[PDB]
Chains A and B, each alone.
Chain A
Amino acid sequence: QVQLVQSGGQMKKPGESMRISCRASGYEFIDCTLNWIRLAPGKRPEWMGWLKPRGGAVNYARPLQGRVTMTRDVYSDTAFLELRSLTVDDTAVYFCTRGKNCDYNWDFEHWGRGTPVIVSS
């Protein structure tokens, strides 16, 4: 058994930066991978990224290159997502996820509560 905590959804305007956090408890953070996902209804879900906390590694998605950043903090045991210059296209919900085991990173067993983000004007 394991669970993931989130700070909820936050709403904002077009064209600025913002942040969102997630954390994990049990099945220690330092060994196994994390994966962000975006859900826009009426649009295809997009693999946002994956961060290996063991060494600060990251491989962002090419369509979002540059204006999205990730960071870790081992002692606090958290996961920060940062993005810049949001548009209405990014109207979606966000999640933080985990895999079954520490060798595969696609068939996601444990998901967060979900956090909507809407911008209209």
Chain B
Amino acid sequence: EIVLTQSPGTLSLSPGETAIISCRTSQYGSLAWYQQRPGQAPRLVIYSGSTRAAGIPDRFSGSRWGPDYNLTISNLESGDFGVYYCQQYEFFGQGTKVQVD
């Protein structure tokens, strides 16, 4: 019982490089992402698909074109890699993760 999804499922990048992530496919609604797990409860990164959230680094910005919806993930660090999620209202994504090194 799932409608929401996101791609790519898993990535393998070193510290400091940039990645491209995207949520799919066509269900209407406000998009959102929640930051990689640091160990405690995660924090926000973005509002309304393309609005940076307060108290967040400037490395990360979204983009939306109808069904197309991408997020660039730049200058990763060992202190920021982890399991991060995509969300619309109730569902969540498959739970992507970017592994450092």
A touches B (Cβ under 8 A): yes
Whether B40 and A47, one on each chain, are in contact in the complex, defined by CB atoms closer than 8 angstroms, is: no
Whether B44 and A107, one on each chain, are in contact in the complex, defined by CB atoms closer than 8 angstroms, is: yes
Contact with B along A23-58 (1 / 0, CB 8 A): 000000000000000000100110100000000000
Question: Size of chain B's interface in residues, with CB distance under 8 A?
Answer: 21
Contact with A along B31-49 (1 / 0, CB 8 A): 0101000001111100100
Question: Size of chain A's interface in residues, with CB distance under 8 A?
Answer: 14
Q: Which of A41, A47, A107, A111 contacts B41 (CB 8 A)?
A: A111
Whether A113 and B41, one on each chain, are in contact in the complex, defined by CB atoms closer than 8 angstroms, is: yes
Complex Cα–Cα for A41 and B97 (A): 12
CB proximity of A113 to chain B, nearest CB, Å: 7
Other than the given A106-B88, A107-B30, A108-B34, 5 more pairs (CB < 8 A) read A44-B91, A44-B94, A100-B47, A106-B89, A111-B41
Interface residues of B (CB under 8 A from A): 2, 30, 32, 34, 40-44, 47, 53, 83, 85, 87-92, 94-95
